[PDB]
Design a protein around this ligand. Structure first.
Ligand SMILES: CC(C)[C@@H](NC(=O)[C@H](CS)NC(=O)CCC[C@H](N)C(=O)O)C(=O)O
Ligand SMILES: [Fe+3]
Length: 329
């Protein structure tokens, strides 16, 4: 038997406004969720998620094999050695069901000094032909900034929750340097569904993606209305119920580092479900040189002996290790 996770719905709208006590009441709810199962649904977030889902489906269902090779990351196309993050992540019929498209900060262009300096984790996005995918790039770039704005407000809530001033995290989250990414993931319906694309957990559960901690400060996730996620608790995995109107929020392992594990990065996994669905995460990453001084809210002096960690090193190592442990997606 599998129980169900408590995932509170938090009205985050005060985080966009100037009612400081209302913001504190949101922060309390974020604190409580972060200390419990680690997840909450952000509601009243102001993003048109119906349009996000519609435009994403139109892209996934119209892109051709030729276009996927043309956009493929280096793991699938040796000609594209600069594409470690951004681009298309191909399915392998018979073996791998999932496929996805990842893009980064649209401000990463050839003019950007991090591109000029060839700093790891910075890449120029690749896009399909506009005439073949009318409106897609424009939608996707505007979405990046829409979800950036939501995430900046959520980071104010997390800062207040931890007893800090509201800009404690958000001051490091900036359009000119953020390493944040959007991933547009398609999980297909397949008949028959090949067993090679299905993993078996230690507890027997059939999975599409194994347990992991998120590589992020926080993760801001939209999913279509098909239940699939489970969060690890001490008493076992618990089902996270779906909600295609809201965003599922949780802390990543950078938050766990800087709070001395006071806000843990929850472990989740993806159950296998034979259903056509979407998983559209926004990974809230800081700048390459961002360093937040660690602290311990449990200690009266807030002191932590954990070393400050540069976000760029954290991200480079984390993305590599996640591929090594859980496979190339
Ligand atoms: C909802 C999640 C479990 C989703 N999985 C994911 O997004 C998994 C686990 S957090 N994330 C990743 O693989 C990291 C992608 C990082 C991205 N290419 C980048 O360069 O920034 C899924 O639906 O599988
Ligand atoms: Fe996760």
């Amino acid at each position: 038997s599998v129980s169900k996770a408590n995932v509170p719905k938090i009205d985050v709208s005060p985080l966009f406004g100037d009612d400081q006590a209302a913001k504190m009441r949101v922060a309390q709810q974020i604190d409580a969720a972060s200390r419990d199962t680690g997840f909450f649904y952000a509601v009243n977030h102001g993003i048109n998620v119906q349009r996000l889902s519609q435009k994403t489906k139109e892209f996934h269902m119209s892109i051709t094999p030729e276009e996927k090779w043309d956009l493929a990351i280096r793991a699938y196309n040796k000609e594209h050695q600069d594409q470690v993050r951004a681009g298309y992540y191909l399915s392998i019929p018979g073996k791998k069901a999932v496929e996805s498209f990842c893009y980064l900060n649209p401000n990463f262009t050839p003019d950007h000094p991090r591109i000029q300096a060839k700093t790891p984790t910075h890449e120029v996005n690749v896009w399909p032909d506009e005439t073949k995918h009318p409106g897609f790039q424009d939608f996707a770039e505007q979405y990046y900034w829409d979800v950036f704005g939501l995430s900046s407000a959520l980071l104010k809530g997390y800062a207040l929750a931890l007893g800090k001033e509201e800009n404690f995290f958000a001051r490091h989250f900036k359009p000119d340097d953020t390493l944040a990414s959007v991933v547009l993931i398609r999980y297909p319906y397949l008949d028959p569904y090949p067993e090679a694309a299905i993993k078996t957990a230690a507890d027997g559960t059939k999975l599409s993606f194994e347990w992991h901690e998120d590589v992020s400060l926080i993760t801001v996730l939209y999913q279509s209305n098909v239940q699939n996620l489970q969060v690890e608790t001490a008493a076992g995995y618990q089902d996270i119920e779906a909600d295609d109107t809201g965003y599922l929020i949780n802390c990543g392992s950078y938050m766990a580092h800087l709070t001395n594990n006071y806000y843990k990065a929850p472990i989740d996994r993806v159950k296998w479900v034979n259903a056509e669905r979407q998983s559209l995460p926004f990974f809230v990453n800081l700048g390459y040189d961002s360093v937040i001084d660690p602290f311990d809210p449990r200690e009266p002096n807030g002191k932590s002996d954990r070393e400050p960690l540069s976000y760029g090193d954290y991200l480079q190592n984390g993305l590599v290790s996640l591929i090594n442990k859980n496979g190339q997606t």
